[PDB]
């Protein structure tokens, strides 16, 4: 066993979509065990402002810019689709 | 489905250390979970050799998520 390997290897919660399109990570981060792990570059994210975040639900109302992770941050692509928990 | 792999475990997980697996296939990076003893998930490659022949293994389970 390689702890190392395994470190950031663990699935991560995602937010869906209601059209159809792969699912995205909220941001360009994730949790493993504890560790901090960032998404690989070209990794498809949702870049949410502050209050999008916090008023983000299960029902489908927020208006989500679509991204690409560029060393851990959420790059814009200008695509928006409507992304919600579940 | 909402939990997917970012990246893949690389090398192969000895299978004494293996409890079960799950799918996570329809995701931007598809991947077979294996989970440990020490209930740890590990993303691996549908790919691999060995992670196809511990899935069709019938001693290892299935995980209902």
């Not at chain 1, 390689?2 to 991560?12: F, H, I, L, S, T």
Request: aromatic share 10%; charged share 20%.
């Amino acid at each position: 066993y390689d702890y190392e390997e395994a470190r950031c290897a663990c699935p991560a919660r995602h937010l869906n979509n209601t059209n159809g399109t792969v699912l995205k990570l909220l941001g360009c981060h994730y949790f493993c065990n504890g560790t901090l792990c960032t998404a690989p570059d070209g990794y498809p994210c949702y870049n949410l402002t502050a209050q999008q975040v916090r008023t983000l639900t299960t029902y489908p109302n927020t208006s989500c810019a679509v991204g690409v992770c560029m060393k851990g941050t959420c790059v814009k692509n200008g695509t928006m689709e409507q992304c919600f928990k579940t | 489905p909402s939990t997917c792999c970012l990246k893949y475990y690389e090398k192969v997980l000895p299978r004494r250390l293996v409890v079960g697996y799950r799918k996570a296939l329809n995701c931007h990076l598809p991947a077979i979970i294996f989970v440990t003893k020490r209930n740890r998930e590990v993303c691996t490659n549908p790919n691999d050799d060995w992670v196809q022949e511990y899935i069709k293994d019938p001693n290892l389970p299935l995980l209902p998520t």
